[PDB]
Design a protein around this ligand. Sequence first.
Ligand SMILES: Nc1ncnc2c1ncn2[C@@H]1O[C@H](C(=O)NCCO)[C@@H](O)[C@H]1O
Length: 225
Amino acid sequence: GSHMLREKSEKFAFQAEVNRMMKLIINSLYKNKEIFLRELISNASDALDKIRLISLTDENALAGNEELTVKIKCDKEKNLLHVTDTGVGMTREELVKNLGTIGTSEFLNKMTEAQEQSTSELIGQFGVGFYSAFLVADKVIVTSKHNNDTQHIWESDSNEFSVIADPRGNTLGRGTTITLVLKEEASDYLELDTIKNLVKKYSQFINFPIYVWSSKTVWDWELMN
Ligand SMILES: Nc1ncnc2c1ncn2[C@@H]1O[C@H](C(=O)NCCO)[C@@H](O)[C@H]1O
């Protein structure tokens, strides 16, 4: 089973439009970097609505994980921020397509014109806030498990991306973990007080419960909304 690594069939290039998109997003929100967390939580919320809808007509929808939540972990020691939801997840095919490709032109011109203003609303409306994670992270990693596939891992430094079967197996049960390798100057997002203030402000209108792994010295999940 060496055919895959010897042929590097796990490596992909982003679609031109996506590269241009990442730049627009990264350039416009340069002064409002914290918005990334809001967009991740928002993407989590959508993923949770989807699985909830599927659970209405599919009796075995929540088999892999009976809960519907969003959990945030700060790993200061490893310089990582994790955002995990137990939503619908993404198959290997969807990781490639949904994250690596994409009113695209209108948004293309609307964004440029919105910079030559605030773009936070547009990005949020068109649902492409995922990329805003690159404002605070050098590498973005997406671990996901969809009912129709095995767990997979997508990773990118924005110059390319790759998808690989997760050698750890099905640890998520169902859902997605957005792991951010924080830039040196973005260490503040590893601070519990900082994350809690952002998560609380950004989860205020999310219908699913959002938790942050915090201390009180004992650790446990803390409800934020
Ligand atoms: N947490 C998440 N769970 C499931 N799907 C997710 C997700 N975060 C992002 N996605 C998928 O990836 C897409 C995405 O954010 N692409 C970035 C902008 O085109 C979303 O439209 C959604 O289909």
